Design a binder for this molecule. Structure first.
Ligand SMILES: *[C@@H]1O[C@H](CO)[C@@H](O[C@@H]2O[C@H](CO)[C@@H](O)[C@H](O)[C@H]2NC(C)=O)[C@H](O)[C@H]1NC(C)=O
Ligand SMILES: *[C@@H]1O[C@H](CO)[C@@H](O[C@@H]2O[C@H](CO)[C@@H](O)[C@H](O)[C@H]2NC(C)=O)[C@H](O)[C@H]1NC(C)=O
Ligand SMILES: *[C@@H]1O[C@H](CO)[C@@H](O[C@@H]2O[C@H](CO)[C@@H](O)[C@H](O)[C@H]2NC(C)=O)[C@H](O)[C@H]1NC(C)=O
Ligand SMILES: *[C@@H]1O[C@H](CO)[C@@H](O[C@@H]2O[C@H](CO)[C@@H](O)[C@H](O)[C@H]2NC(C)=O)[C@H](O)[C@H]1NC(C)=O
Ligand code: NAG
Ligand code: NAG
Lengths: 261, 90, 345, 118
């Protein structure tokens, strides 16, 4: 039925409109070569402190040598080794040591440049914008059973579509899952995803990219680029024995190879 | 727009300058004067002239300096030296 | 080098196992061999009688010495003008391979002058010199002379604040232009002798750019650097002889998984498809393209991804390490300066 | 140009309190400015150990101003760092350089293409 029977019973000539291509459609007609990569998809919503700690014992032995030079700065020396990293300025001890007031002019500058490098680290983390994905694709463990995970989720496809036949050739049990997960309208499923009446949805990826580029807020985010998916194309169906096919294919190869596409 | 490094810098956008246009010179008494000018406004009034200018132009294009800040420091320390001289003469 | 002897060796990989799956599907035996040169095939005027001829795999197929080109064929218009094609399988774009103070000394020269002159004005105002110096050490780095020292300590924060600001500015905003950002780079529209961009010699990328009638600059520029194989290009960009290379996306992604310094670019252009090179109207067209689409529909494509495609192979140590080396080197001299006071006391 | 004036007035308002706080409960009566503006920048300077409780509350609320002042000044430095200036000495055809190059110390030079309409 549909656009297929108009070509099979030859009331029409060719299907210039967009059409998914599978095996049994190619059994009855002869498709042209495709021009656009349109797959399917699912729409969803250590040693830094160590090198300081090694030299901390060396500076503590230097403070012991200050005590040997010329009277209780042991744990206060640990406070000083903290303050030469952090500069908290707690009133405890006035340093009377000749040597002990010399290396502080290096260690406090090291603390200043370490604080500047930590601000640089936080600015570089501000540059980094993260994006995580719960589902990777068709090889998800969520696709085993929604009762296996704690939320029983829901996802369907277009009714009476070729994606239904593709999944029935992929997984007949997934057809039984989608049998309670059917829907009618594409924008109705969009509203169900926005309001929360639907969890996931399987559809052709390029139309979802066209809708996501005009999405109000970019809340619904696709997953990947068709890596664990069908990743098919869109050609033009013609009747078997039509002489126009070679010329139309040369026109396609001209229309792609010029940047006008 | 094709300069390697963008070192040479233009001055303004033609404000204290000539700011003229480029026409097409024809002989006096030519019948094509109306039709060529119609074709010009047809080529401009559809973005096609803008498409050609997009084709044939490129609208593209680093060091520390605090000499004003160092001059301010050097002036304020001289002011502090004058304030110390106020206490010195007392 | 050595075109003299043709040797039988072992071949495996992607299209080998693809054709093994085809032989599992279709009833045929094989004759697997290679091409005598390193060219895809270009139609060029031969030296005599001013006649076009093909080369590479195409000239050997059209000579009848071969039967089927199972290879990543760059399918375009001029190849289709002569022979019939199958529907493609490898769908991918194109990418570009790349490879990835004095003022403080002035402040240090001024701060000891300040530290001297504050004590030399302290001697007029009704180990004190070393006390004043050791008090001034913690000013820049953490009664009228105290009014001067509070102003100097006010400058001590603003100097290191400007130093922190422009050291953050030196690493956040002004990122060096290690990327090209694709075809729209103005430094490649009119390039120089430094940005060495090239591709495989006599490839269909050059033919696709030959159809491009607005890139006559890049066509006559890569002629000094058109290389035979991509294995030449890997070592040439490893030895920093190249600077840009034009090839498919997923192959260079797999080589980025091989070598971490091999870095692609951001843009993704010429999203094309690759199929099996075929003859004219043949009994190995209908069944074979049905087997191609049967390979498209099942999970054998994901199996091929699991073979080669899916498989792969601030930390604060950049600028503070060279400072910390001088810090650790100064410790020995600082300890040695204590022995002078040992001999003094 | 009006920031330092109100910061000076705030400095007087802060320094007036620790006089009477120490008066209710021995060298930082009028010397509170040397502590106050010295601890604006947090220069780790030994000044005085504060004993007034209201003075400690005032130091605690003043140190948050000292934190946000250096935060806002690093913000001002970053905002000036965004501003990459593109300035030119010559403004146009009415330049003072276009009278005599002996007026300025470097002898400069400028010309056009030969046989030009310019
Ligand atoms: C999807 O397909 C089913 C097929 O049953 C449609 O249901 C009716 O089926 C009968 C018998 O095949 C047809 O005569 C009717 O034309 C179908 N219904 C209508 C349109 O009246 C079903 O309606 C189809 N539509 C969707 C999207 O659910
Ligand atoms: C390609 O490799 C094979 C390696 O066995 C070459 O065969 C012989 O290799 C031995 C050892 O290196 C040489 O001593 C012979 O000279 C090679 N045979 C001859 C007659 O060439 C093979 O020939 C190599 N290809 C060429 C044409 O050099
Ligand atoms: C695949 O090829 C075979 C031939 O290799 C086709 O099957 C033949 O069909 C014709 C009738 O049209 C008859 O000769 C036989 O029924 C078949 N011959 C053999 C040897 O198979 C077949 O049509 C092709 N593809 C399919 C499955 O339709
Ligand atoms: C303007 O153009 C003309 C023609 O090129 C130049 O005038 C003469 O050019 C010939 C070329 O052989 C010389 O031999 C003469 O000496 C030139 N005479 C003059 C007027 O100098 C002229 O040099 C060009 N330059 C200007 C004036 O802009
Ligand atoms: C392939 O064809 C040959 C023809 O003799 C036949 O013997 C063989 O059984 C066939 N193999 C199959 C089952 O494809
Ligand atoms: C002449 O012959 C050689 C060998 O076939 C070939 O490589 C070359 O391209 C020919 N010359 C030209 C310019 O056609």
């Amino acid at each position: 039925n549909g656009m297929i029977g108009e070509v099979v019973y030859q009331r029409a000539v060719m299907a210039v409109g967009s059409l998914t291509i599978n095996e049994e459609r190619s059994e009855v007609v002869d498709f042209s070569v495709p021009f656009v990569e349109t797959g399917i998809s699912v729409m969803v919503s250590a040693s830094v402190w160590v090198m300081m700690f090694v030299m901390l014992l060396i500076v503590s032995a230097i403070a012991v040598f200050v005590f040997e030079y010329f009277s209780f700065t042991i744990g206060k020396a640990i406070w000083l080794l903290w303050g030469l990293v952090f500069n908290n300025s707690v009133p405890v001890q006035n340093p009377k040591g000749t040597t002990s007031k010399i290396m502080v002019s290096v260690w406090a500058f090291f603390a200043v440049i370490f604080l500047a490098s930590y601000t640089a680290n936080l600015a570089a983390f501000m540059i980094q914008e993260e994006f995580v994905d719960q589902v990777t694709g068709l090889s998800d463990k969520k696709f085993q059973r929604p009762h296996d995970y704690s939320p029983p989720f829901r996802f369907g496809t277009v009714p009476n579509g070729s994606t239904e036949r593709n999944i029935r050739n992929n997984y007949p049990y997934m057809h039984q899952y989608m049998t309670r997960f059917n829907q009618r309208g594409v924008e109705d499923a969009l509203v169900s995803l926005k309001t929360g009446k639907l969890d996931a949805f399987i559809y052709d990826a390029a139309v979802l990219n066209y809708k996501a580029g005009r999405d109000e807020g970019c809340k619904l985010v696709t997953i990947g680029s068709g890596y664990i998916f069908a990743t098919t194309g869109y050609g033009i169906a013609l009747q078997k024995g039509s002489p126009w096919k070679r010329q139309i294919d040369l026109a396609l190869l001209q229309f792609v190879g010029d940047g006008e596409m | 727009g094709r300069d390697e490094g963008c070192k040479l810098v233009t001055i303004g956008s033609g404000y204290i300058f000539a700011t003229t246009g480029y026409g097409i010179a024809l002989q006096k008494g030519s019948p094509w004067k109306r039709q060529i000018d119609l074709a010009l406004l047809q080529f401009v009034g559809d973005g096609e002239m803008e498409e050609l200018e997009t084709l044939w132009l490129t609208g593209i294009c680093s060091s520390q300096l605090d000499i004003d800040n160092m001059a301010g420091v050097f002036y304020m320390l001289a002011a502090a030296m004058a304030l110390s001289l106020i206490t010195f003469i007392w | 080098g050595s075109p003299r002897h043709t040797v039988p060796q072992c071949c495996y990989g992607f299209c080998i196992d693809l054709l093994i799956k085809l032989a599992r599907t279709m009833n045929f035996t094989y004759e697997v061999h290679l091409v005598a040169d390193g060219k895809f095939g270009t139609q060029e005027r031969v030296n005599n009688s001013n006649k076009k001829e093909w080369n590479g795999m195409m000239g050997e197929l059209l000579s009848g010495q071969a039967d089927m080109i199972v290879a990543p064929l760059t399918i375009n218009n001029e190849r289709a003008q002569y022979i019939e094609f199958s529907k493609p399988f490898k769908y991918q774009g194109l990418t570009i391979l790349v490879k990835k103070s004095t003022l403080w000394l002035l402040v240090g020269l001024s701060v000891h002058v300040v530290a001297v002159m504050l004590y030399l004005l302290d001697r007029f105002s009704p180990l004190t010199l070393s006390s004043a110096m050791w008090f001034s050490w913690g000013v820049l780095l953490n009664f009228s002379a105290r009014i001067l020292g509070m102003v100097w300590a006010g400058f001590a924060m603003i100097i290191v604040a400007s130093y922190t600001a422009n050291l953050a500015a030196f690493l956040v905003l002004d990122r060096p232009e290690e990327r090209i950002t694709g075809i729209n780079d103005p430094r490649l529209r009119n390039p120089s002798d430094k940005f060495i961009y090239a591709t495989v010699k006599q490839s269909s990328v050059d033919i696709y750019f030959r159809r491009q009638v607005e890139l006559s600059t890049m066509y006559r520029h890569m002629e000094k650097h058109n290389y035979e194989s991509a294995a030449e290009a890997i070592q040439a960009v490893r030895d920093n002889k190249l600077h840009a290379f034009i090839w498919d996306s997923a192959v260079l992604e797999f080589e980025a998984s091989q070598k971490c310094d091999l870095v692609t670019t951001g843009e993704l252009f010429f999203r094309s498809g690759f199929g099996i090179g075929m003859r004219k109207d043949s009994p190995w067209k209908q069944n074979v393209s049905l087997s191609i689409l049967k390979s498209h529909e099942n999970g054998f494509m994901e199996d091929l991804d699991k073979t080669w495609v899916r498989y792969q192979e601030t930390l604060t140590f950049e600028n503070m390490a060279g400072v910390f080396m001088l810090v650790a080197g100064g410790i020995v001299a600082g300890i040695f300066l204590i022995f002078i006071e040992i001999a003094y006391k």
